[PDB]
Write an enzyme that holds these catalytic residues in place. Structure first.
Site, PDB file in Angstrom:
ATOM      1  N   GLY A   9      67.135  26.290  39.796  1.00  0.00           N
ATOM      2  CA  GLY A   9      67.833  25.911  41.013  1.00  0.00           C
ATOM      3  C   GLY A   9      67.556  26.807  42.208  1.00  0.00           C
ATOM      4  N   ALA A  10      66.776  27.862  42.052  1.00  0.00           N
ATOM      5  CA  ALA A  10      66.430  28.765  43.134  1.00  0.00           C
ATOM      6  C   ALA A  10      65.219  28.254  43.900  1.00  0.00           C
ATOM      7  CB  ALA A  10      66.110  30.159  42.603  1.00  0.00           C
ATOM      8  N   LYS A  11      65.042  28.708  45.138  1.00  0.00           N
ATOM      9  CA  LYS A  11      63.880  28.241  45.901  1.00  0.00           C
ATOM     10  C   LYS A  11      62.861  29.374  46.005  1.00  0.00           C
ATOM     11  CE  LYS A  11      64.503  24.185  47.624  1.00  0.00           C
ATOM     12  NZ  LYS A  11      65.727  23.866  48.410  1.00  0.00           N
ATOM     13  N   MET A  12      61.586  29.095  45.777  1.00  0.00           N
ATOM     14  CA  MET A  12      60.551  30.134  45.831  1.00  0.00           C
ATOM     15  C   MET A  12      59.644  29.916  47.031  1.00  0.00           C
ATOM     16  SD  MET A  12      57.955  30.975  42.750  1.00  0.00           S
ATOM     17  CE  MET A  12      56.860  32.389  42.778  1.00  0.00           C
ATOM     18  N   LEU A  17      52.928  37.772  49.237  1.00  0.00           N
ATOM     19  CA  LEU A  17      52.004  38.854  49.383  1.00  0.00           C
ATOM     20  C   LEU A  17      51.644  39.485  48.031  1.00  0.00           C
ATOM     21  CD1 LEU A  17      50.471  40.865  51.374  1.00  0.00           C
ATOM     22  CD2 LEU A  17      52.481  42.309  51.151  1.00  0.00           C
ATOM     23  N   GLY A  18      50.344  39.489  47.776  1.00  0.00           N
ATOM     24  CA  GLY A  18      49.832  40.140  46.568  1.00  0.00           C
ATOM     25  C   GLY A  18      49.693  41.633  46.751  1.00  0.00           C
ATOM     26  N   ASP A  43      54.523  39.604  45.324  1.00  0.00           N
ATOM     27  CA  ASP A  43      54.098  39.591  43.943  1.00  0.00           C
ATOM     28  C   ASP A  43      53.711  40.987  43.475  1.00  0.00           C
ATOM     29  OD1 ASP A  43      53.184  37.948  41.537  1.00  0.00           O
ATOM     30  OD2 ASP A  43      51.495  39.277  41.869  1.00  0.00           O
ATOM     31  N   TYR A  48      50.240  47.468  38.388  1.00  0.00           N
ATOM     32  CA  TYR A  48      49.641  47.751  39.692  1.00  0.00           C
ATOM     33  C   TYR A  48      49.937  49.168  40.198  1.00  0.00           C
ATOM     34  CZ  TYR A  48      49.218  42.641  39.705  1.00  0.00           C
ATOM     35  OH  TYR A  48      48.955  41.319  39.388  1.00  0.00           O
ATOM     36  N   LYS A  77      56.060  41.568  36.520  1.00  0.00           N
ATOM     37  CA  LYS A  77      55.431  41.111  35.282  1.00  0.00           C
ATOM     38  C   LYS A  77      55.477  42.191  34.196  1.00  0.00           C
ATOM     39  CE  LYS A  77      52.206  38.944  38.438  1.00  0.00           C
ATOM     40  NZ  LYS A  77      51.706  39.990  39.353  1.00  0.00           N
ATOM     41  N   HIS A 110      52.967  38.872  31.705  1.00  0.00           N
ATOM     42  CA  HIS A 110      51.782  39.008  32.530  1.00  0.00           C
ATOM     43  C   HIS A 110      50.531  38.361  31.955  1.00  0.00           C
ATOM     44  CE1 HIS A 110      50.117  41.998  35.710  1.00  0.00           C
ATOM     45  NE2 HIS A 110      49.334  40.942  35.692  1.00  0.00           N
TER      46      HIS A 110
HETATM   47  N1  LIG Z   1      48.928  37.330  37.137  1.00  0.00           N
HETATM   48  C1  LIG Z   1      47.808  38.026  37.083  1.00  0.00           C
HETATM   49  O1  LIG Z   1      47.165  38.221  36.060  1.00  0.00           O
HETATM   50  C2  LIG Z   1      47.098  38.318  38.401  1.00  0.00           C
HETATM   51  C3  LIG Z   1      45.703  38.636  38.399  1.00  0.00           C
HETATM   52  C4  LIG Z   1      45.047  38.898  39.630  1.00  0.00           C
HETATM   53  C5  LIG Z   1      45.777  38.834  40.829  1.00  0.00           C
HETATM   54  N2  LIG Z   1      47.164  38.526  40.741  1.00  0.00           N
HETATM   55  C6  LIG Z   1      48.039  38.677  41.971  1.00  0.00           C
HETATM   56  O2  LIG Z   1      47.387  37.882  42.968  1.00  0.00           O
HETATM   57  C7  LIG Z   1      47.147  38.691  44.193  1.00  0.00           C
HETATM   58  C8  LIG Z   1      45.968  38.130  44.959  1.00  0.00           C
HETATM   59  O3  LIG Z   1      44.775  38.206  44.145  1.00  0.00           O
HETATM   60  P1  LIG Z   1      43.722  39.392  44.319  1.00  0.00           P
HETATM   61  O4  LIG Z   1      44.373  40.635  44.780  1.00  0.00           O
HETATM   62  O5  LIG Z   1      42.930  39.388  43.050  1.00  0.00           O
HETATM   63  O6  LIG Z   1      42.708  38.897  45.444  1.00  0.00           O
HETATM   64  P2  LIG Z   1      42.679  37.926  46.745  1.00  0.00           P
HETATM   65  O7  LIG Z   1      44.028  37.856  47.311  1.00  0.00           O
HETATM   66  O8  LIG Z   1      41.874  36.762  46.424  1.00  0.00           O
HETATM   67  O9  LIG Z   1      41.705  38.826  47.671  1.00  0.00           O
HETATM   68  C9  LIG Z   1      42.148  40.091  48.135  1.00  0.00           C
HETATM   69  C10 LIG Z   1      40.896  40.697  48.848  1.00  0.00           C
HETATM   70  O10 LIG Z   1      40.720  39.894  50.051  1.00  0.00           O
HETATM   71  C11 LIG Z   1      40.642  40.657  51.221  1.00  0.00           C
HETATM   72  N3  LIG Z   1      41.232  39.861  52.248  1.00  0.00           N
HETATM   73  C12 LIG Z   1      42.546  39.478  52.423  1.00  0.00           C
HETATM   74  N4  LIG Z   1      42.794  38.750  53.489  1.00  0.00           N
HETATM   75  C13 LIG Z   1      41.521  38.662  54.047  1.00  0.00           C
HETATM   76  C14 LIG Z   1      41.213  37.980  55.223  1.00  0.00           C
HETATM   77  N5  LIG Z   1      42.060  37.306  56.002  1.00  0.00           N
HETATM   78  N6  LIG Z   1      39.863  38.034  55.578  1.00  0.00           N
HETATM   79  C15 LIG Z   1      38.931  38.708  54.819  1.00  0.00           C
HETATM   80  N7  LIG Z   1      39.258  39.372  53.667  1.00  0.00           N
HETATM   81  C16 LIG Z   1      40.589  39.326  53.300  1.00  0.00           C
HETATM   82  C17 LIG Z   1      41.482  41.895  50.873  1.00  0.00           C
HETATM   83  O11 LIG Z   1      41.084  43.020  51.674  1.00  0.00           O
HETATM   84  P3  LIG Z   1      42.159  44.142  52.235  1.00  0.00           P
HETATM   85  O12 LIG Z   1      43.329  44.213  51.300  1.00  0.00           O
HETATM   86  O13 LIG Z   1      41.265  45.383  52.221  1.00  0.00           O
HETATM   87  O14 LIG Z   1      42.561  43.617  53.639  1.00  0.00           O
HETATM   88  C18 LIG Z   1      41.076  42.149  49.386  1.00  0.00           C
HETATM   89  O15 LIG Z   1      39.803  42.792  49.249  1.00  0.00           O
HETATM   90  C19 LIG Z   1      47.020  40.111  43.576  1.00  0.00           C
HETATM   91  O16 LIG Z   1      47.093  41.131  44.564  1.00  0.00           O
HETATM   92  C20 LIG Z   1      48.136  40.077  42.537  1.00  0.00           C
HETATM   93  O17 LIG Z   1      49.384  40.187  43.262  1.00  0.00           O
HETATM   94  C21 LIG Z   1      47.849  38.262  39.578  1.00  0.00           C
HETATM   95  O1  LIG Z   2      46.385  41.721  35.480  1.00  0.00           O
HETATM   96  C1  LIG Z   2      46.265  41.639  36.733  1.00  0.00           C
HETATM   97  O2  LIG Z   2      47.250  41.218  37.366  1.00  0.00           O
HETATM   98  C2  LIG Z   2      44.921  41.803  37.347  1.00  0.00           C
HETATM   99  C3  LIG Z   2      44.065  42.666  36.407  1.00  0.00           C
HETATM  100  N1  LIG Z   2      43.203  41.938  35.769  1.00  0.00           N
HETATM  101  N2  LIG Z   2      42.332  42.619  34.947  1.00  0.00           N
HETATM  102  C4  LIG Z   2      41.353  41.781  34.235  1.00  0.00           C
HETATM  103  C5  LIG Z   2      42.187  41.421  32.919  1.00  0.00           C
HETATM  104  N3  LIG Z   2      41.855  40.465  32.091  1.00  0.00           N
HETATM  105  C6  LIG Z   2      42.718  40.311  30.993  1.00  0.00           C
HETATM  106  C7  LIG Z   2      42.623  39.377  29.939  1.00  0.00           C
HETATM  107  C8  LIG Z   2      43.602  39.399  28.953  1.00  0.00           C
HETATM  108  C9  LIG Z   2      43.559  38.427  27.809  1.00  0.00           C
HETATM  109  F1  LIG Z   2      44.760  37.690  27.837  1.00  0.00           F
HETATM  110  F2  LIG Z   2      42.840  37.361  28.126  1.00  0.00           F
HETATM  111  F3  LIG Z   2      43.387  38.812  26.621  1.00  0.00           F
HETATM  112  C10 LIG Z   2      44.653  40.306  28.960  1.00  0.00           C
HETATM  113  C11 LIG Z   2      44.779  41.230  29.963  1.00  0.00           C
HETATM  114  C12 LIG Z   2      43.801  41.210  30.972  1.00  0.00           C
HETATM  115  S1  LIG Z   2      43.670  42.219  32.352  1.00  0.00           S
HETATM  116  C13 LIG Z   2      42.311  43.978  34.759  1.00  0.00           C
HETATM  117  O3  LIG Z   2      41.513  44.518  34.013  1.00  0.00           O
HETATM  118  C14 LIG Z   2      43.300  44.707  35.486  1.00  0.00           C
HETATM  119  C15 LIG Z   2      43.337  46.104  35.333  1.00  0.00           C
HETATM  120  C16 LIG Z   2      44.287  46.824  36.035  1.00  0.00           C
HETATM  121  C17 LIG Z   2      45.223  46.225  36.899  1.00  0.00           C
HETATM  122  C18 LIG Z   2      45.176  44.848  37.041  1.00  0.00           C
HETATM  123  C19 LIG Z   2      44.209  44.075  36.335  1.00  0.00           C
END
Ligand SMILES: NC(=O)c1ccc[n+]([C@@H]2O[C@H](COP(=O)([O-])OP(=O)(O)OC[C@H]3O[C@@H](n4cnc5c(N)ncnc54)[C@H](OP(=O)(O)O)[C@@H]3O)[C@@H](O)[C@H]2O)c1
Ligand SMILES: O=C(O)Cc1nn(Cc2nc3cc(C(F)(F)F)ccc3s2)c(=O)c2ccccc12
Length: 315
Positions: A9-12, A17-18, A43, A48, A77, A110
């Protein structure tokens, strides 16, 4: 519309910002600026290793009376080394303490893989294989459910789960909370059509990470494809008098996804938020989906033997 309704029921907010790879030396400033220009969703993750500094920026802007806590949507996460049921609350509370919050709006498993518990975040054996833990998805999910019921988190979800893994949870007998969100990699080179369709058909909200193709990922190789540098996407952007990044952010928004681009550059943080004032055409959308190549920035090969490695399955 700026937010999407979750199954709690919450809004996201659909734009957040990553913070992966944002140094503590700049994420405090990033978050202050992001809040100042309109971001309400941040996020985060324990892994991190910058949550304290995110925390510093939130606390100060609350103090500055720029925003109220209720207006903010803070995500974090559970890292892989804490999947044991006895370790989950502790890991959540560490994140809460670092972020100087008393609740999270959303807490995600995560990755579906549990790793051997210990200080090290990526425990490897002598030959470079990740050392797994004897934990399973369902028991971990049970422990996530307890965090809701104790009021530490308002919603729970998963990240990097394939559709079969998601289904394991949905079909859990005695399920208390369905996952609210599945956060997955998603961009024009990895369009996730089948996993998105699955999740949306179950009323699970999908968050797209690495929407710009993570050019700062630490394992990037020069030969790798580069979204921000793709002349085709540059051409779509030029046609709309927007930047390539703005196009890459707007694209998932029009697929009813949440998107979390990362920057620590103040000018880019502002730029990236300015995407509610234009629409990509049906042709643009079709074109951007046609660039799919099943290319992942996040898929650590040292994990491919874990029993729960999620990317063997087609989706
Ligand atoms: N759930 C997970 O496993 C997982 C995994 C990966 C990522 N994530 C989350 O997703 C977020 C976003 O993904 P990401 O950090 O991998 O990469 P991304 O957001 O695809 O790309 C970030 C990169 O893009 C550059 N950038 C940002 N805006 C730009 C713009 N307007 N023009 C040109 N370059 C630009 C940034 O540079 P600067 O920062 O130097 O400006 C940085 O090098 C992460 O930070 C994290 O919060 C979650
Ligand atoms: O995690 C972030 O948010 C970004 C992220 N991604 N990855 C690539 C990864 N690939 C995976 C694959 C599995 C697997 F599930 F597939 F086994 C499990 C865990 C991981 S970490 C990293 O190695 C990492 C290291 C430090 C901080 C953030 C990250």
């Amino acid at each position: 519309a700026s937010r999407i309704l979750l199954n709690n029921g919450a809004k996201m907010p659909i734009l957040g910002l990553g913070t992966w790879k944002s140094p503590p030396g700049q994420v405090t400033e990033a978050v202050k600026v992001a809040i100042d220009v309109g971001y309400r969703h941040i996020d985060c993750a324990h892994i991190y290793q910058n949550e304290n500094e995110v925390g510093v920026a939130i606390q100060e802007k609350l103090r500055e009376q720029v925003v109220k806590r209720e207006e903010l949507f803070i995500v974090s996460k559970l890292w892989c080394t804490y999947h044991e049921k006895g370790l989950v609350k502790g890991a959540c509370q560490k994140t809460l303490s670092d972020l100087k919050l008393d609740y999270l709006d959303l807490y995600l498993i995560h990755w579906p893989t549990g790793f051997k518990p210990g200080k090290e975040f990526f425990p490897l054996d002598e030959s470079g294989n990740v050392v797994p833990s004897d934990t399973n998805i369902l028991d971990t999910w049970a422990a996530m459910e307890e965090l809701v019921d104790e009021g530490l988190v308002k919603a729970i979800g998963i990240s990097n789960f394939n559709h079969l893994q998601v289904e394991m949870i949905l079909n859990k007998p005695g399920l208390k909370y369905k996952p609210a969100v599945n956060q997955i990699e998603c961009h024009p080179y990895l369009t996730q059509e089948k996993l998105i369709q699955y999740c949306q058909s179950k009323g699970i909200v999908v968050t797209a990470y690495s929407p710009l193709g993570s050019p700062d990922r630490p394992w990037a190789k020069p030969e790798d494809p580069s979204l921000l540098e793709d002349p085709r996407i540059k051409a779509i952007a030029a046609k709309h008098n927007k930047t390539t990044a703005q196009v890459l952010i707007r694209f998932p928004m029009q697929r009813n996804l949440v998107v979390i681009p990362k920057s620590v550059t103040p000018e880019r943080i502002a730029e990236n938020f300015k995407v509610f004032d234009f629409e990509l055409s049906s042709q643009d959308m079709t074109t951007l989906l046609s660039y799919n190549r099943n290319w992942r920035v996040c898929a650590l090969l040292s994990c491919t033997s874990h029993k729960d490695y999620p990317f063997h399955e087609e989706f």
